[PDB]
Ligand binder design. Structure first.
Ligand SMILES: [Zn+2]
Lengths: 8, 264
């Protein structure tokens, strides 16, 4: 599942 | 060019509008990157993560309580209402409009929008830590112990609330600690929402981007899915584009002024 802001 | 957009707007049977922080920012909502610089002295790392909520749930709830209460004086701006009215006007023609929003303030729902997708959740929903139930909650104050708390002045006494008096789960056999149904840094998006949005964004034949850009998250996840099918994409944000290399449709300026003429 997708990290918000892709992590950083 | 405006009338080139308007030509597509007239044809379009399925519009998808992706919204970012710019739209919420024009209603005066603090968004911790633009307006409302920081809260007390704190940063995302001791505020908007699961770790920070485990270490200090009083402080996080203090923070999220502030953001719930500021909404009582922040109202939908013209962009919010132009979208919502457009949805209703087109919907009655048999033409869909859906909103995919990163915003957690519920301003689209207050504006009158109906078909909304909140990909980061909402300030006014609670998820229970025990049983996982999601409930809408606009109660002010959310719980007694937070009344008058969450003040934004960097030298405010911490509420330091006993965890059993923070917002608890009303389903009586549970009594679990609640949290804002919000997507924190280091958590994932909901798989069911992403599927639904994939479906909508494959359906759509005109995609709007308001309050953000297609290069940056979250528009960058899907705007390749739509542009690759030759679907026109229109940005309504405050950033400029290059000296020569234009966007296909890009309307510089505040969303409150740009958008309502576009959607009439
Ligand atoms: Zn529960």
């Amino acid at each position: 599942x997708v990290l918000x802001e892709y992590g950083v | 060019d405006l009338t080139a957009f308007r030509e597509h707007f007239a044809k379009a049977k399925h519009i998808a509008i992706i919204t970012g922080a710019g739209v919420s920012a024009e209603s005066g909502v603090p968004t911790f990157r633009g307006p409302g610089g920081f809260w007390r002295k704190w940063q995302a790392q001791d505020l908007a993560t699961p770790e920070a909520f485990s270490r200090d749930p009083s402080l996080v709830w203090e923070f999220y309580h502030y953001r719930r209460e500021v909404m009582r004086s922040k109202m939908p701006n013209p962009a919010h209402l132009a979208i919502a009215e457009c949805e209703a006007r087109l919907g009655q023609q048999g033409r869909s409009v859906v909103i995919i929003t990163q915003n957690i303030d519920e301003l689209h729902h207050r504006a009158g929008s109906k078909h909304v997708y909140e990909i980061h959740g909402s300030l006014f929903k609670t998820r229970c830590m025990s049983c996982g139930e999601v409930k809408a909650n606009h109660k002010s104050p959310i719980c007694p112990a937070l009344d008058g708390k969450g003040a934004p002045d960097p030298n405010t006494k911490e509420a330091r609330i006993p965890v059993e008096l923070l917002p608890r789960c009303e389903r009586k056999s549970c009594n679990g600690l609640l949290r804002p149904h919000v997507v924190w840094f280091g958590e994932t998006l909901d798989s069911d929402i992403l599927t639904a949005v994939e479906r909508e964004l494959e359906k759509c034949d005109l995609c709007l981007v308001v309050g953000t850009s297609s290069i940056v998250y979250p528009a960058a996840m899907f705007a390749p899915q739509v542009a690759s099918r030759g679907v026109p994409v229109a940005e309504f944000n405050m950033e400029c584009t290059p000296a020569t290399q234009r966007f296909k449709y890009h309307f510089e300026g505040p969303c409150g002024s740009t958008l309502p003429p576009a959607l009439e």
